[PDB]
PDB file of all heavy atoms in Angstrom:
ATOM      1  N   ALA A   3      36.931  -0.761  18.906  1.00 30.19           N
ATOM      2  CA  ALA A   3      36.337  -1.230  20.152  1.00 30.19           C
ATOM      3  C   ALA A   3      36.357  -2.781  20.051  1.00 30.19           C
ATOM      4  O   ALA A   3      36.634  -3.285  21.158  1.00 30.19           O
ATOM      5  CB  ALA A   3      34.954  -0.734  20.226  1.00 30.19           C
ATOM      6  N   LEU A   4      35.959  -3.379  19.028  1.00 29.86           N
ATOM      7  CA  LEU A   4      35.865  -4.806  18.876  1.00 29.86           C
ATOM      8  C   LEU A   4      37.366  -5.420  18.750  1.00 29.86           C
ATOM      9  O   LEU A   4      37.604  -6.350  19.590  1.00 29.86           O
ATOM     10  CB  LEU A   4      35.147  -5.279  17.590  1.00 29.86           C
ATOM     11  CG  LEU A   4      34.599  -6.656  17.738  1.00 29.86           C
ATOM     12  CD1 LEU A   4      34.169  -6.977  19.226  1.00 29.86           C
ATOM     13  CD2 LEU A   4      33.438  -6.961  16.785  1.00 29.86           C
ATOM     14  N   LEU A   5      38.240  -4.861  18.022  1.00 27.52           N
ATOM     15  CA  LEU A   5      39.672  -5.136  17.973  1.00 27.52           C
ATOM     16  C   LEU A   5      40.198  -5.017  19.309  1.00 27.52           C
ATOM     17  O   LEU A   5      40.746  -5.993  19.935  1.00 27.52           O
ATOM     18  CB  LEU A   5      40.417  -4.157  17.046  1.00 27.52           C
ATOM     19  CG  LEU A   5      41.064  -4.869  15.874  1.00 27.52           C
ATOM     20  CD1 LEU A   5      41.976  -3.833  15.238  1.00 27.52           C
ATOM     21  CD2 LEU A   5      41.959  -6.028  16.377  1.00 27.52           C
ATOM     22  N   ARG A   6      39.941  -3.878  20.040  1.00 25.50           N
ATOM     23  CA  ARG A   6      40.491  -3.602  21.364  1.00 25.50           C
ATOM     24  C   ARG A   6      40.006  -4.716  22.336  1.00 25.50           C
ATOM     25  O   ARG A   6      40.915  -5.221  23.105  1.00 25.50           O
ATOM     26  CB  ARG A   6      39.994  -2.273  21.991  1.00 25.50           C
ATOM     27  CG  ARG A   6      40.779  -1.826  23.105  1.00 25.50           C
ATOM     28  CD  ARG A   6      41.222  -0.326  22.982  1.00 25.50           C
ATOM     29  NE  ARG A   6      40.229   0.357  22.196  1.00 25.50           N
ATOM     30  CZ  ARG A   6      40.455   1.480  21.564  1.00 25.50           C
ATOM     31  NH1 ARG A   6      41.742   1.988  21.474  1.00 25.50           N
ATOM     32  NH2 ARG A   6      39.516   2.111  20.899  1.00 25.50           N
ATOM     33  N   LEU A   8      39.052  -7.905  21.451  1.00 21.20           N
ATOM     34  CA  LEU A   8      39.728  -9.229  21.090  1.00 21.20           C
ATOM     35  C   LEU A   8      41.119  -9.233  21.538  1.00 21.20           C
ATOM     36  O   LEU A   8      41.667 -10.366  21.712  1.00 21.20           O
ATOM     37  CB  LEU A   8      39.473  -9.360  19.632  1.00 21.20           C
ATOM     38  CG  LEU A   8      38.042  -9.594  19.195  1.00 21.20           C
ATOM     39  CD1 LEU A   8      37.891  -9.596  17.655  1.00 21.20           C
ATOM     40  CD2 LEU A   8      37.441 -10.900  19.701  1.00 21.20           C
TER      41      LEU A   8
ATOM     42  N   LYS B  61      48.651 -12.518  19.000  1.00  7.45           N
ATOM     43  CA  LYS B  61      48.683 -12.549  20.429  1.00  7.45           C
ATOM     44  C   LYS B  61      49.614 -13.644  21.009  1.00  7.45           C
ATOM     45  O   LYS B  61      50.006 -13.495  22.197  1.00  7.45           O
ATOM     46  CB  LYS B  61      47.316 -12.893  21.038  1.00  7.45           C
ATOM     47  CG  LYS B  61      46.234 -11.650  21.045  1.00  7.45           C
ATOM     48  CD  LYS B  61      44.867 -12.111  21.316  1.00  7.45           C
ATOM     49  CE  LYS B  61      44.293 -11.507  22.568  1.00  7.45           C
ATOM     50  NZ  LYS B  61      44.195 -12.494  23.694  1.00  7.45           N
ATOM     51  N   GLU B  72      47.640   0.477  21.342  1.00  2.00           N
ATOM     52  CA  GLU B  72      47.364   1.385  20.199  1.00  2.00           C
ATOM     53  C   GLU B  72      48.472   0.989  19.139  1.00  2.00           C
ATOM     54  O   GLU B  72      48.048   1.203  18.006  1.00  2.00           O
ATOM     55  CB  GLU B  72      47.525   2.873  20.625  1.00  2.00           C
ATOM     56  CG  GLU B  72      46.429   3.341  21.467  1.00  2.00           C
ATOM     57  CD  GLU B  72      45.011   3.096  21.117  1.00  2.00           C
ATOM     58  OE1 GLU B  72      44.669   3.224  19.841  1.00  2.00           O
ATOM     59  OE2 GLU B  72      44.232   2.562  21.906  1.00  2.00           O
ATOM     60  N   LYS B  79      45.943  -3.878  11.953  1.00  2.00           N
ATOM     61  CA  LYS B  79      45.269  -3.255  10.739  1.00  2.00           C
ATOM     62  C   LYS B  79      46.130  -3.318   9.536  1.00  2.00           C
ATOM     63  O   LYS B  79      45.624  -3.785   8.432  1.00  2.00           O
ATOM     64  CB  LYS B  79      44.950  -1.848  11.117  1.00  2.00           C
ATOM     65  CG  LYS B  79      43.606  -1.602  11.946  1.00  2.00           C
ATOM     66  CD  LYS B  79      43.498  -0.289  12.602  1.00  2.00           C
ATOM     67  CE  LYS B  79      42.351   0.402  11.978  1.00  2.00           C
ATOM     68  NZ  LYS B  79      42.182   1.787  12.580  1.00  2.00           N
ATOM     69  N   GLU B 226      36.623  -2.521  11.091  1.00  2.00           N
ATOM     70  CA  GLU B 226      37.519  -2.034  12.149  1.00  2.00           C
ATOM     71  C   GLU B 226      38.990  -2.360  11.792  1.00  2.00           C
ATOM     72  O   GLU B 226      39.896  -1.942  12.455  1.00  2.00           O
ATOM     73  CB  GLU B 226      37.337  -2.711  13.530  1.00  2.00           C
ATOM     74  CG  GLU B 226      36.334  -1.993  14.308  1.00  2.00           C
ATOM     75  CD  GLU B 226      36.450  -2.345  15.769  1.00  2.00           C
ATOM     76  OE1 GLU B 226      37.244  -3.287  16.036  1.00  2.00           O
ATOM     77  OE2 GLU B 226      35.671  -1.824  16.537  1.00  2.00           O
TER      78      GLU B 226
END
Side-chain angles (χ1 to χ4, degrees):
Chain A
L4 204 36
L5 239 191
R6 196 134 29 206
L8 292 169
Chain B
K61 279 169 121 260
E72 292 308 314
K79 277 162 116 185
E226 273 201 353

